[PDB]
Symmetry: D2
Subunit: 327 residues, 4 copies
């Protein structure tokens, strides 16, 4: 019962990448003067080493999964779309009716602080808000937790270039919008874990989940997009509106492709020219086989590669999307 | 956005009960010799005060809710159906594919240990197992984490409401998690739908809600099973619910009272025509439901059979049996 | 157990309408010398009086509801969007894998024939194709299709009466039943499987409303018994994409709305969106555009037919007379 | 787009059976003097030959599938469980809120009359009631519901040879069974959009038929038949989102007579994949072994012991006098 949700990064500041391709870590030396260097969390008023970051077991964020979150990443010392992330995070907490114990500006400053104190130039930055464990010592009960740890990869840097295989899950379906809405990024992964176990048993890396009506939704930690005859399709319902997805669609429109956020069928996936995954934890990933059949030509698709390359170049190009971190 | 899931017991060792009725706390002075008294947790090899019980934020039990659990209670210093609870707990972790980092016997001893150290004679005892946060410090052994805690007994509905009854709605804005998403058969921490249903109950002016499944059948509520009585038979859902151990006990009691029992599909129409409706959970026992969607259930007061089952339930806490295990304090 | 799916038009060539408003029947006298006048069907190669139109009980269109269809109407002697209707009909039969035993031009000609022979200037024209009852009489060498095409033209039918087209109706969101899922029997294919739509009508009746809107499995608003559901909010018209028929009245309403400068969005619609809407209206060939002025016992917007509903409805009925590619006069 | 729902019987009074096995047609000669012989229907008060049996196209039983039904069969001149069928029929029409325009006793007499006039000793006897096409010809007091009956030659979902040798099935992945809160499979009905889709999927995947899952992923039934499985001395069959079949009821009665336990309740695909035996049950053919599922053998991959015992006993009950059989008076 070994389970692989993330392929790389879990305790590795620098992961191996394809030489000469578009994904390259920063070349630097981490000053370890601070015990916060390498991973820093903010928990109940204090910045703490990641190895020491702990939460009350009585927080309903645990016992009821009464919690929502987002993950923004830092690459080459630049935050990517931090404000978009904190905006989505706040909208989700409102929908979940979890009161926010901090302002948008305070959350962004806490996130910048964890990164700065960690010294990490490539980072995974989780912020979550829970319903809390009751009255705080010392009036909102909601708890905000933040951490910046080394960048995490659902699929490894090598597979970002070379591609992955997938199945459409048959043993499990995605959480319905009227049960716990995937539109709200959340920690309830019972169906996503089941789907990953199914993919493993079927000899594939990961799975795409269908919803109650049989339409394609997302996978465990990533959105699913397809390209067919000049148009990029991706699900509207029963998925997170990913910000990597948002970026990929912006890039595709800049390339002159049309984009449709709307219902996607398995039959559409099986006739697609290309399929790729999208998530903050790794970026744009070609899906080159589906249910044991090649997607398109069976190699990373032409548009997927362009979109992926443009995505990584956007981590360095000055724009409204990139914010340098003050170390 | 204030949310009431539990009505009593949170940081409250002894709660108010109805004098002369079947629910009575122990009469004693809590021995506070040890800092564990009043609330004891077991976390990563150590017994610690409940107030200091913390888990790694990186446990997948948090970030993926990759966790299952059970809750057994202690009443009058007796564990109730401890072995049934650990057996169900183990079966659910197997189904969830979470490797168990201890034996049944070790789990039972950790639970007994937390209660004994807490000194509580009326206690809520949670054990859960998580996928974990990766390789355990110092240690390819298992990564799963077992956490235990014993805290003062918790009440979904207060002791006074266990006697006087509560009101409910059938939820219309949310459905119960399907068996083929995350099965309610496995007791779990994914309460997104159960919290939404509680908010809907509050908006509609009722205490709590019963959720329907995708096909429109009655399942359970936020932290409790739903049973109904009609013309000499007790009905309760089979699918898309936890097979509750309070439910199991109530059905055993009902049969000994001469009632028939059917675990099977339950419709809203069945509920609306019921003679009686009650809730069942370890966190409070057997609760009359006296109004549904603003209409009285039967005569609108706690029903004859509900009261008999409730009384027998609490009497079982004091009756030596294979269900009762005294805790050594 | 009495059930009202249609309010007017059954065995009534002329129904009462609101004087001065946009819905008016033709003024004429029907020549009844032909037994086909007043209602004509085409069944298995013969034009017959509608009252005598019967089909084999062994047709799988009955025993398995293995059938799809469309309804086009005639108003003031003009077919409205006949070609759009036959194209959707053909596309649905293909999806349902029912071989079509006639060409598009032949179907259009049979529908024109039924109307012409009925003499009706205001008509409801149903064409359906069934899987059939097996090998046709006289055979046609196993090679041949078993599918059956049935057509009829009868007096125009009203899901909601002409008066209610002006004054509006009330509705409920159904709670006892849900719409057929796309992965069971897709509402995208116009079909005769109305088990859920009948249940929803009964529920509306029990709750004291004229009709019901059904939700899908995920809780989104779909359509009602025989009509699409549209809403208006802050300059945008919304209507469901999934688990509904892509109605041609809906199509026309959205075209009119964009001509009026409104935005249009075919996509997921929630009950919360409906409860906040400025306006709600129904759309179907059997009646046109109907204001919905109360939902679940609460007024919709200001509680009277909305400004945009009325403008769209008025333009819709005007399009029955305005020369265009949407209307084709019937040769009587 | 050729679709196979039934394998035999559609226009054949006598179909091929396996010599020596439990299924044998009567040996007789049908007098065809009467136009009713070989197939008789009752429509709006008239007994008519099957080939002339037609209904108004305006019946809502067509345009809205506002109709429920049952099928009882006749074998060796005996009706099998006729009264059980009419009681279930009546109960479904009540749930569907279709007023019944005839008594139970009248319904049974019409079915016996169609069979008698048909002359068929092995027959498929459908009775359905529809919402109707409006006021009947000839007061608005009166019911508009239409009762239609026909007796035609016995029909086979799976051929009599396959009844002995077994069939292969798939679990459908492209379609699900109609939910109880859409149109309840508990009411026998004509809405087969999902069942037809499931059949096309089976054909595409190279199996004879499919089993449909419900929304929650549990095993329901197939196109015109219930699904039962045997595991370690217990027969399992779905409770929800299926017709409570009368063949199923008989098979469970027999299983308990044989000492087996029976559970009507939720069935998962994992239960099917672990079963000793799987079989189908329907009035149109009886008890059929399912010997392969999703391309994998069921148990030993040949008709199972209990399946053959139940099927053999089923066919023998067509001849043994009992409360279940009622001879037709021809
Ligand atoms: C986070 C995640 C995604 C991707 O969202 P991003 O904003 O691009 O990181 C998609 N689906 C699920 C379930 C996720 O958890
Ligand atoms: C715990 C709980 C129950 C009750 O189960 P018990 O064994 O009686 O405590 C029922 N349903 C849910 C969702 C629960 O969390
Ligand atoms: C036909 C009908 C409609 C309306 O479609 P039109 O093309 O406008 O007539 C909508 N929904 C259902 C279920 C219908 O039967
Ligand atoms: C009729 C049929 C059955 C079998 O029912 P019987 O009473 O045994 O004939 C099972 N399922 C479906 C869908 C059917 O149509």
């Amino acid at each position: 019962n070994q389970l692989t949700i993330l392929e790389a990064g879990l305790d590795e500041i620098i992961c191996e990448t394809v030489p000469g391709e578009a994904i390259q870590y920063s070349r630097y030396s981490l000053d370890r003067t601070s015990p916060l260097a390498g991973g820093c969390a903010w928990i109940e008023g204090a910045f703490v080493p990641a190895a020491a970051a702990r939460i009350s077991i009585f927080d309903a964020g645990f016992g009821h999964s009464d919690v929502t979150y987002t993950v923004a990443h830092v690459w080459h010392g630049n935050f990517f779309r931090l404000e978009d992330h904190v905006e989505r995070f706040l909208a989700g907490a409102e929908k979940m009716r979890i009161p926010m114990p901090a302002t948008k500006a305070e959350i962004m400053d806490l996130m910048r602080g964890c990164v700065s104190k960690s010294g990490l130039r490539e980072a995974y930055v989780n912020v979550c808000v829970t319903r809390g464990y009751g009255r705080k010592p010392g009036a909102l009960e909601s708890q905000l937790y933040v951490y910046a740890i080394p960048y995490l990869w659902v699929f490894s840097p090598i597979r970002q270039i070379e591609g992955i295989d997938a199945v459409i899950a048959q043993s499990v379906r995605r959480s319905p919008a009227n049960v716990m809405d995937p539109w709200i990024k959340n920690y309830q992964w019972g169906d996503l874990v089941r789907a990953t176990f199914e993919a493993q048993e079927r000899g594939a890396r990961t799975a795409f989940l269908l919803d109650s009506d049989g339409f394609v939704t997302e996978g465990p930690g990533f959105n699913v997009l397809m390209v067919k005859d000049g148009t990029v399709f991706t699900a509207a319902r029963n998925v997170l509106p990913g910000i990597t997805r948002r970026t990929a669609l912006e890039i595709a429109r800049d390339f002159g492709l049309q984009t449709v956020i709307g219902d996607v069928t398995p039959e559409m996936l099986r006739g697609a020219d290309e399929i790729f995954a999208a998530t903050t934890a790794g970026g744009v990933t070609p899906v080159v086989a589906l249910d044991g059949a090649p997607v398109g030509a069976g190699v990373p698709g032409d548009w997927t590669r362009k979109i992926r390359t443009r995505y990584w170049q956007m981590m360095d190009e000055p724009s409204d999307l990139i914010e340098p971190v003050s170390y």
